[model samples]
Target: QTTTVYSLEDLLPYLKQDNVDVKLAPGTYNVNGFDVGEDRLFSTTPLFLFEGSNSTYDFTDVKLNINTVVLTKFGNNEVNEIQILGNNNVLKNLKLEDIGTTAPSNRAQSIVIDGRDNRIEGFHLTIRGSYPYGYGDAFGKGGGSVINHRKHSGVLIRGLRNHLKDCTIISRSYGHIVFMQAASYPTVEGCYIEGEMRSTDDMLAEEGTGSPADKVDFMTVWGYKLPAGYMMSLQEGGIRAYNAGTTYIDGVEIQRATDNPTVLNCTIKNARTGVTLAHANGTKYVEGCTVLGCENGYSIGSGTVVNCGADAIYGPVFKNTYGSDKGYNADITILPPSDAYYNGHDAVAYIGGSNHNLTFRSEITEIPSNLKIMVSGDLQGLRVLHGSNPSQNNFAGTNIVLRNLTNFPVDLHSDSSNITVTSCDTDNITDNGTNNSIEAIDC
Candidate 1:
């Protein structure tokens, strides 16, 4: 049997109950800071706290409007609207919307999961409110940001075997839309994530001395001033995983890293990177995803990507993080950019890893003429170099088998060794490396 409740107060009885099914009445409900009780005033206690196990919550046609004033009531502490601390529970089909927008001085989030085997499905989130909203990570993230950041990511998962499926986020914040920390075996599938995009050229054209770019002399944490001709996502990530972070559960702080994350059939638009699962410990698998209008498309370390696609509208389609990452396998197709805007990095794909197999094909004829498939080299056209794109692309201490199906030329760096290239077009391999074989094959 299912119990249907008309008010949040009436629904409280089932929050911590196991093996039960509950449903909220189909209507729009508003929750604000005044509605919070004294017991919920803790630093990590959320507005809606689910402490039960083995339950299912169905919120069909229900919209919960959490006013932004609730974030301010927490002072300098972080706030979360919804938190699940129970295992084997499901929350489905909830339209969670923020009522107002404000730039607070601390962190905030829509949801946080801190238990095992919990799933949130078919949810719609309109995320709003974060400090320093206009610019992306050009300033920085975490402690390295030029300005102090108060991020408000959509969801932060910090437990084992948690899953988020078929969710959509309309992001208007400076944090990651959906990110995982201290999580293992998490899966995010069939989700559509979006964030706002801004051009560096527009930031440089600001007239007043009060802009964030002007306040810092347009200098970025990347050790360079904000340059023109590049597009940046205001949000940090689409579906990202951190190597390590501190998470609090029941006021107990624990530190851990993410492990073995899987993503499938998701579409991300206008974020910094589409799928950034490089920092995971175990096997990372991403398949059948599409990224559009992002700064960079896909980035992974020692993982497998199958049938994924990304367009190099502002950055490379896929980038390797290190030369020591062995056994990397990917089958990716490069799609055409949506517009005529180009940042002029001159590399369609920047690759660097050892003992890896990568196959790239493109049917688009409008690829940039000067753009080459760069195999281990420094990024050109940018004024500074960072650890993210460090000289890992040097092709040194690396072995790669590249199957290039596009007509673009390949630029082989000097330190490359044991590299094999099979091209379907003309022999456009610019071999400046050592111990390599280049062949032209026909279909």
Candidate 2:
């Protein structure tokens, strides 16, 4: 475990040696080309680069305090690739930009880190997505970009931690800031992602019924195809946590100009769908996430718990868009057996319509056994409409209770035969019954 200190001037000679520990100082170093054959260590530098020929290095325990480095290709096709494999690395106040030619078809990236713990803090990673011909697209298909834990497992990857207090990741049309795949327990917190939004002509079609056609036209912009799901947009999420899993995300902002990924605790202001949990089940929680002005606030899969905090869940589609000519003209759908009660005041719950059977399966958990129906302050404060038909026959159940019916000064209409009321503190209770049974207690 020998430690070697190297300034910007000493980096050239050190690259010709074997495995060594190198400490970088706090200043900009202009190196034509260099390579560390074994695991290298780095910390607190203004600028550093491996701009020589195609270099390969084992970057284990690579630490950076507050630095900005550039990994450029130095005018040579034979030396246009740089690969880093490290563990337990901490990068703070760092910036990584790739500037090189697109010839030889192999530029930079392919940096794989397989480790138990990794932390990247307060850094800006920008990858150029433009190149010459025959170099793949400038954004996708891996021209020159960052690849983390490629084809590996059981790795702990943390992206842009420390609340991203001062961090940004910008990608060109062909470059992505960070790419993670086949990795587990990876957490990306407090980071800002910005990229191009791909569009197409198909987006001009009308959405639902009564929608205007040719209103939303998708066209090519920034030298890329203009269609839904075309052109590499931003950093996509491809990490999973199986059984015995642990992950946490707090205070992050994600913008999808073209690419859409599932995010938690993030503020997504502009996107087609805010956060999409696609068929992923098993005990996942998204707390204190605010989604506004999106097509859909959230499209959740089955068996996911969304414990929202105050001002956490918000979608302007209802207040400004719903019921309008161009609003989301679809029935509000709420899944059954969901414990979604009083998360917030502006929360929307869609019930079934008339002629549709709205079944409430009895699965008591926190409520008392005698409590057949429970209503909160919201139920008493707002107006609820019943969309059932008048001539249809009604059914009866074993027990039923209507709480907080004090707001309405009208008769309660239900097609059932047997019904009961408890804790009716309001002075407005009218019963409309042609052939029914009713009982009241504590009225």
Candidate 3:
């Protein structure tokens, strides 16, 4: 590995002229300084490309600033900040930032990794969208950063076996940080990904009643072309571990996102639908993970196992109610479908659902006497029921009580069927219903 030193002007010529493997030393190299006026492989442009096979161009401590860098007319199709077309390369401690301080006219990524078997470490990238001057729209126009992967097959793919650690990738535009059609098997570990996701209404607003010809450019807009107007919404699984053979994710925090990656011991917070497994054949083993302040904590299709966490497991929706009540039409609707949602309810002494063997080990509890548990169509107080009729009717073992007391004349519609009084200790219990089976063991 020979180290190469080149000034801002000499860098592009050295990259285009030399076929030898080189190492870039620590320095602020201006990528847009040299104006190569069209007519070259990269059109005599200042853009750098490493085409040599089996080469390593290490930016051990270098910072390449291409802020507001001007490119040729066809630059969108030809230019790249650092085009890694070579194999077995390593980029370390490299910082790339755009200078425009706003969105630019053309859409270009900060770093385009088009090679295989590479390791990118300690990369601090910043991309600023068109802010004060307002070049592009927020989330659709500009941001301080972007990363993309070119086409490659499963084993022959370029981004496979690449490790990205201690890095931050942010963007202001939709589809700014994208893995192209064929890029696969890339591992992003210990990195912070921040992006402003556009909502569905934002796209519809942009496509306002334009002519069919004017709609052509609007159709090409990436943000408007997404399902639910999301740029990074994974095809089936959000973070695809499909061809990569079982990706490992540990000790990482994902916020306001969704993924299908096989994760272990990861904490997700304040996001909608933390991790959704879409494919039936895909297997995900999650253990000791905490997801809070999100809807559908973990949505699964099939072949998914949630091993642990007191607040992580949840059952499927059946009739939109967990426990049924015929008297008051009050039933429990577990919101968001997670064990965490059950935290609001108290534990019960017994448990029984539609499935007989599915015994609840003092987990489900009766709703407090005065307080009301939210029901589908009404708010009713919950209590425990005990009787031969309740047990015979499959409503005895573990039942969520709903108080529907109406003060009508001539027997105000109150009935108690099965009755078993295990203990009369008031201190051990708060409020037992008219019929309940109890013991003096404890409260």
Specify the highest-TM-score model's number. 1
In order, candidate lDDTs are 0.81, 0.28, 0.34
The per-candidate count of clashes, in order, stands at 2, 10, 23
Query: Which pairs of residues have clashing backbones in candidate 2?
Result: 33-52, 53-79, 54-79, 138-174, 139-174, 139-175, 199-226, 199-227, 200-226, 200-227
By TM-score, rank the candidates, best first.
Answer: 1, 3, 2
Candidate 1 backbone collisions, by pair: 376-393, 377-393
* TM-scores for candidates 1 onward, in order: 0.93, 0.37, 0.44
Candidate 3 residues lying further than 4 Å off, grouped into runs, are 8-21, 33-36, 39-46, 69-79, 101-106, 129-159, 176-180, 196-443
Ranking by lDDT: 1, 3, 2
Worst 10 residues of 3 by lDDT: 405-414
lDDT per residue as tens, model 1, 1-443: 88899998788778867788999999999877777556643333477788888899999999998877777786787888888888889999999998777865588888999878999999999998888888887777868679778888998988888999999988988889999999888999999999978888888887375877787888887787777777888998898999997664544667889999999999998888898888888999999999888777777787899999988777778777667677778888888777665755677777777888999888877667767888776666342355443544444636799999877688888777778989876466788777888889884
Residue 169, model 2: lDDT of 51
Runs off by more than 4 Å, candidate 1: 36-44, 246-254, 381-397
lDDT of 2 by residue, 1-443 (tens): 53444453455344434344444444443322232112332221112322222222222333322111222322222221222223334435544444442222233332222232444456555444233211112222332322211111111222222112234555442332333332333344555544433222223233343322222222111223232322122222212222222222222322211111223444433233334432233223333344433323343322121432111121211111111111111212122212222222132322111111111211223422211221111111011212122111122221222332222122334432223433233344344423323343352
